[PDB]
Amino acid sequence: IIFVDPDKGILLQEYQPIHTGGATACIGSCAPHLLTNKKSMVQPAPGSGAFQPFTSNVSKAIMTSFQGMQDSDDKTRRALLDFSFNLATGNMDEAFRSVKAIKNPAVWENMAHMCIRNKRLDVAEHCL
């Protein structure tokens, strides 16, 4: 899991396992998780010898540096995906300065709140 900075090369955030139901390949990444693969088979129908069609062979691997991300709103997504960009690469504009210095009238659900991994808590103390 890598936020590639466009300037200083590839800069890494975390090593997130694919191993979610015998999964050894990540085929995508939705918002709350990573869409990894799975074993491709046909599920038996419950309580009978019949076979239900499979739901999806795509295991949504939950992403781990993004805590309070997925149960929460999509201001979380912007704010703390931006913070995790500030994690792997290293920045300050996105999760804090870009949202202070614009005259943005609201009261967000998650201004930013995992931002303590770059050592700041007040964005999870006055928003939350």
Binding site: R97, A101, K103
Partner: protein, 210 residues
């Protein structure tokens, strides 16, 4: 909306921090005439440099050339000059930023510079600068410099055929691979024995010293 009042509160309640703070906060209400001027008294000369260099105001970023004289400002200004006709500046900052192949491309296609290219790649011996010079060596003939620019450009046949006739035959065999050994002298000499200049072919056949 009190860009004025907030700005005078942004000199009187700070030394550095609220200058940049209210500067980027004035970027939140698009007041360049205050945020940009309190970039320099907030030390945000990078921000002023970028803003001045980007909105076709390279003269305003000319004082900020003095601390960022880089390719992203000078070559950007030169590329704008290339767009609006000043390709001299374009090749100048190409040479400053190492766009050497475009330096000689402008030499031979826009700047009308045979001999700047003929000497700068006699020095440089780069690839596509010598390719532009191989086009120009297909248009002119400097000397062993010209066979240089034909040979390290991949323009094999041109220097080859000049060697087949013209005396530029040892320097062709030199800059293709090498012309010092009896083996290459024999082989390029046999090329001449098949394609004219048999005189100097047999001469270096004798320089093979059988």
């Amino acid at each position: 909306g009190d860009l004025r009042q907030g700005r005078q509160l942004a000199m009187q309640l700070n030394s550095q921090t609220l200058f940049k703070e209210c500067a980027l906060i004035l970027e939140g209400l698009q007041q360049l005439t205050e945020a940009a001027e309190m970039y320099e008294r907030a030390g945000q000369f990078e921000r002023a440099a970028s803003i001045y260099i980007q909105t076709k105001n390279f003269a305003a970023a000319a004082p900020l050339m003095a601390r960022i004289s880089s390719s992203k400002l000078q070559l950007q200004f030169a590329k704008a000059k290339e767009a609006e006709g000043r390709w001299q500046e374009a090749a100048a900052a190409y040479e400053a930023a190492g766009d050497m192949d475009a330096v000689v491309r402008l030499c031979l296609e826009r700047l009308s510079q045979p001999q700047r290219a003929y000497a700068i790649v006699r020095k440089t011996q780069s690839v596509e600068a010598a390719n532009q010079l191989s086009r120009f060596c297909l248009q002119s003939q400097d000397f062993g410099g010209a066979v240089e620019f034909l040979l390290m450009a991949g323009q094999m046949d041109q220097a080859f055929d000049i060697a087949m006739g013209h005396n530029e035959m040892d320097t062709f065999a030199r800059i293709v691979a090498a012309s010092a050994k009896p083996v290459d002298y024999q082989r390029i000499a046999q090329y001449y024995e098949s394609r004219g200049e048999y005189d100097k072919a047999a001469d270096m056949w004798s320089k093979c010293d059988q």
